[PDB]
Design a protein around this ligand. Structure first.
Ligand code: NAG
Ligand code: NAG
Lengths: 13, 178, 189
């Protein structure tokens, strides 16, 4: 029953 | 055929940031940055599902850092202001002295910053009013809804006043019983 | 406030076809409303949309961990989240409230417009037809189109441009997923 977050990634550099 | 969108944003110099989930143009939930709580669009959603607000706050921190990188990389190229189009409607056909809701639909605008004020006979309405967060669009502009429940009468006129940096003067959209 | 603004818009999209049979994931990034870089599940790696996104596409594609997480999203993120909210999103069916009332094009003449108000329904998929004495009236129809109220309800007003003559029976027929056969509301002059 938990909504999953698409984890944000850092840009370069 | 359905679409689920996890829409986020970070805006400078305002330091404004939002995180939300969209299902076919409708908001499932959003996370308030002032607090650390998952705000469900409808009460029932929170009873059938759950979300860890911490994930949203962590993503907003990454978006902020990414915006800094992007601002520098673009050699400080600013956003072009796209002014909104405003529509005032009622959630159902209006019946005299039978409660209804006034909807102020703010659409097709960027950046996601707007000052929205309901006016009853030219006077601001501070209580009873509710609003949505900045909702996504296919063209990557923003949508927003402002709500005002009311008792329809022939003596009370309403106006939704919207202010945006893309507008020369505030936009006023009218509603009266006919 | 005349100060310049800078906006970063990540959009993580999950597109569904035949339930969860075919699922497509897109991780898109917009800088000042302009798409710079994107991951599309049909491609399998990051691609630059503008020259601004080229460093990110190359950097994210060089990391096997980032690529594997994005390639797994259709199952671990898309299909998962679809199942979490299915009962109150995909399964959501809210009946329309159908009302028929006469109105006027301009306040200088008698009732020359018949309004069919179709409100508070979910989902947005709807068909509204006007009938006069069992025959479909195609010409003279003006609608507001589909209106999203923002509270998981939709509304529409389908108006017929007609001068009602006594004895005429007009029917507004509504078709929506919430009801098995069509809905009908009659109006007599
Ligand atoms: C500054 O960044 C822009 C990208 O928006 C690029 O076109 C331009 O060449 C850069 N200027 C310099 C001096 O490198
Ligand atoms: C809203 O009002 C405040 C105070 O008057 C002002 O500083 C701000 O710039 C306004 N925002 C917009 C979008 O007009």
């Amino acid at each position: 029953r938990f909504y999953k977050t698409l984890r944000a990634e850092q840009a370069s550099q | 055929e359905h679409v689920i969108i996890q829409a986020e944003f970070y805006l400078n110099p305002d330091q404004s940031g939002e995180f939300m989930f969209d299902f076919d143009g409708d908001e499932i939930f959003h996370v308030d940055m002032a607090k650390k709580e998952t705000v469900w669009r409808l009460e029932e959603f929170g009873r059938f599902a759950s979300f860890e607000a911490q994930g949203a706050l962590a993503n907003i921190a990454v978006d902020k850092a990414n915006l800094e990188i992007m601002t520098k990389r673009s050699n400080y190229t600013p956003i072009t202001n796209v002014p909104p189009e405003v529509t005032v409607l009622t959630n159902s056909p209006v019946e005299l002295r039978e409660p209804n809701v006034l909807i102020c639909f703010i659409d097709k605008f960027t950046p996601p910053v707007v000052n929205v004020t309901w006016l009853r006979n030219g006077k601001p309405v501070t209580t009873g009013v509710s609003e949505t967060v900045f909702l996504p669009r296919e063209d990557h502009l923003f949508r927003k809804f402002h709500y005002l429940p009311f008792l329809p009468s022939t003596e009370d006129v309403y106006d939704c006043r919207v202010e945006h940096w893309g507008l020369d003067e505030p936009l006023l959209k009218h509603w009266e019983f006919d | 406030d005349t100060r310049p603004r800078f906006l970063w818009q990540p959009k993580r999209e999950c597109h569904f076809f035949n339930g969860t049979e075919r699922v497509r994931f897109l991780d898109r990034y917009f800088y000042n409303q302009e798409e710079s870089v994107r991951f599309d599940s049909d491609v399998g790696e990051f691609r630059a949309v503008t020259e601004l996104g080229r460093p990110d596409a190359e950097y994210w594609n060089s990391q096997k961990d980032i690529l594997e997480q994005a390639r797994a999203a259709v199952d671990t993120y898309c299909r998962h989240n679809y199942g979490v909210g299915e009962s109150f999103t995909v399964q959501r069916r809210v009946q329309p409230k159908v009302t028929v009332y006469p109105s006027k094009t301009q306040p200088l003449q008698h009732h020359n417009l018949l309004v069919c108000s179709v409100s508070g329904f979910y989902p947005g998929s709807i068909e509204v037809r006007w009938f006069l004495n069992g025959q479909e009236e195609k010409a003279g129809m003006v609608s507001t189109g589909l209106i999203q109220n923002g509270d998981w309800t939709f509304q529409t007003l389908v108006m017929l441009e007609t001068v009602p003559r006594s004895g005429e029976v007009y029917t507004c027929q509504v078709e929506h997923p919430s009801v098995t056969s069509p809905l009908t509301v009659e109006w007599r002059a």
